[PDB]
Amino acid sequence: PVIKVRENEPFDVALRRFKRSCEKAGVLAEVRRREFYEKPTTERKRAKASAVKRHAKKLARENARRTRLY
Amino acid sequence: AHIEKQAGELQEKLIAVNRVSKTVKGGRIFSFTALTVVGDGNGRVGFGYGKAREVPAAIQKAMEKARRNMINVALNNGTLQHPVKGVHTGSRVFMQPASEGTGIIAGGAMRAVLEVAGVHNVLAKAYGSTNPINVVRATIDGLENMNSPEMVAAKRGKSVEEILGK
């Protein structure tokens, strides 16, 4: 949740929740559970399923954007 | 499409008739559905699926829609001019032409659909599961799909012109 890089300035609350994003990502939450090779790999193919679909969504969105209904 | 029920030559006929159901929020409803065909004894045949709360209006609406699904067919003799062994839906359809001096020879849908369509000396057959409802898809597999002598003759005539042109 932190990295070896230091903060040496006065703080009470400091940035260390994007040092969380330079360490933890669920990599300290995989230490109490076992999985097969199948499980996480299929989930990776839902984050590239997101990215191909992102392009496809834009064509659909464009029709809605024309009209005002918000 | 266009009307197949025409005064002085109309040849109203029916095919299926039964009830179907949907399961509603309360109980369950019944929709009075049925298949029909009106002929003329000269082709011009179609089909319709009505929805009604009664058997008379099931056949009303199906003959309305029959005219809206008319297919044209033209032939010589009392028999189809070309065999079609094509299959539409899971009911398998076969259809031979046959010389006059034989009946329709069919107890299914294609007894009556092959009557109205100006044919009555045709010999036909079907394989697969028994289900009159998609025996009716011999509209597609014989009446709609066909060959005729003057169709094939203009294949033979088209080619000649091209050789001359070059």
Binding site: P1, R17, F18, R20, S21, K24, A25 | -
Partner: protein
Amino acid sequence: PRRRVIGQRKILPDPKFGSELLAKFVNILMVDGKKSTAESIVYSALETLAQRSGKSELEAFEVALENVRPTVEVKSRRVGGSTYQVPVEVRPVRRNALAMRWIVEAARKRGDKSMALRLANELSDAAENKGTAVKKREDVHRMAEANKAFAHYRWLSLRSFSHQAGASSKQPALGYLN
């Protein structure tokens, strides 16, 4: 499920205080929907207080009650992420209600004649926190300040925290609490 604002009650000024706050103190001391029989006890006990203590007419109630009211009430709801029931820091309006109620409750734990004399002597001991109605405070406020896990429902909330910027520690919840 709840649509629009709650009702507001417009109530009369007292004929001896002019207040609607101490009109709400007649209201708590009503039983069987009779304001008539209520108003009796109120003034009977105001005098008892004035003799047995120093104070003032707006300190015989007010000050005494500001030593019975906690600033946190712990309510109920099954969810908590630990099957916890969450502290709720109460609005200043709800502060009033708590203390007022408890002083009348305290006079049904007494049998010291009338009802005026009961709540009067109780309120006289309630401004120095030596009463028995100020000991009700010492369980609501004792609990709340000695144990917290806040209004977050810990498992549900944690997922929401993680998505927003990456956290596991307490923050606002971006995602659903459903």
